C-alpha cells in the first residue's frame, strides 16, 4: 500500500507555514494518477498556495498537478494525472508530493489545527490498476 | 437571473429507475472575452444516481480535452468537482460561447424512489476571463426527476 501523510508542523499565529504531503511505498510501476481530499479549518489556516512536490517529474509541473481549495466546504482537493499520456510523468519514488503553504491566522488558538483525510478517488499505477492506500492526518500545532 | 452574470445550470431530466441518463451542465452569458478557467462543486445523491462518467462539453475546444478539463467524483462526500483551465496558456482554448460545459452520465439505481434527485450547487472557486478577472456567476441546480 502507498502511504500518504500530511506533516504536522509547528507555527505561531501570523506565520506562513509549509506543510509537506508525502508519499511512501510508491510501487515499481509508479503512480500515473491520483486524486483525494483533505479537510482543514479555514478559520485558523488560510491556504495561500499548494506547490507541486519533488515527486512531480513533469517539466511543466502544473500540467500534471493541480489542487482546488474550497474554504466554505473546508476542503482541499488534490489532483494528479501525469500529462504525457504514456505514463512518462508518473511518480516513481517516495518523497514530497505537494507542499501546502498556509498562513496561521493572527488570532488562532494554540494547539493542533487538523488537516484530516476525507476521501480518495483514484490512485493508480502505470497499468492504471488501482493501488491500496493508507492516508494519515497532519496539520499545524499552533504555539 | 442576472444578465451580467454567467449562469451555470445543470439540466433537470426525467428518467425511470435503471436508465442511464445524460445530464448536461450549461453555461449562459459567457463573455466574448472568454473564460480562461473555472472550478466548482455540486452535490448529488449517490444512493439514487451512480455517476458513470463526466464528459467534456462542446464548449471544451482543446484538441486534448483532458488537458483543459477534468472532474473528480466523491460518492462518500456526495460531491462532484468540475475543473477547467484552458491548456494553451495564451487564452486560445478559453470558453467563448454559450452552451454545454459538460455532460454528467449517470445510472438511476434500479431501486431508486420516484421524485427529484437533486444535483445541487455547493461552491465556486474561480471563474475568470482571459485577462484573469473574476466574473460574476449565478449557479442553479438540476437533477433527475425519477418516475
Curated annotation (Swiss-Prot), chain B:
**Domain of life, source organism:** Bacteria
Q: Which residues form the Cohesin domain?
A: 5-147
Localization? Secreted
PTM: O-glycosylated on most but not all Thr residues of the linker units. The reducing sugar is galactopyranose.
Please name every pair of cysteines joined by a disulfide bond in this record.
none
Domain remark text: The cohesin domains bind to the dockerin domain born by the catalytic components of the cellulosome.
Sum up the protein's function in the record's words: Acts as a scaffolding protein in the cellulosome. It promotes binding of cellulose to the catalytic domains of the cellulolytic enzymes.
Annotated protein name in UniProt: Cellulosomal-scaffolding protein A
Lineage, please?
Bacteria, Bacillati, Bacillota, Clostridia, Eubacteriales
Amino acid at each position: 500500500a502507498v502511504r500518504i501523510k500530511v506533516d504536522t508542523v509547528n507555527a505561531k499565529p501570523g506565520d506562513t507555514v509549509r506543510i509537506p504531503v508525502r508519499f511512501s511505498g510508491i510501487p515499481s510501476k509508479g503512480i500515473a494518477n491520483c486524486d483525494f481530499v483533505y479537510s482543514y479549518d479555514p478559520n485558523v489556516l488560510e491556504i495561500i498556495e499548494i506547490e507541486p512536490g519533488e515527486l512531480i517529474v513533469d517539466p511543466n509541473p502544473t500540467k500534471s498537478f493541480d489542487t482546488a481549495v474550497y474554504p466554505d466546504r473546508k476542503m482541499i482537493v488534490f489532483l494528479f494525472a501525469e500529462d504525457s499520456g504514456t505514463g512518462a510523468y508518473a511518480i516513481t519514488e517516495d518523497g514530497v508530493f505537494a507542499t501546502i503553504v498556509a498562513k496561521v491566522k493572527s488570532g488562532a488558538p494554540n494547539g493542533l489545527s487538523v488537516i484530516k483525510f476525507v476521501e480518495v478517488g483514484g490512485f493508480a499505477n502505470n497499468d492504471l490498476v488501482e493501488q491500496k492506500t493508507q492516508f494519515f492526518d497532519g496539520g499545524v500545532n499552533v504555539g
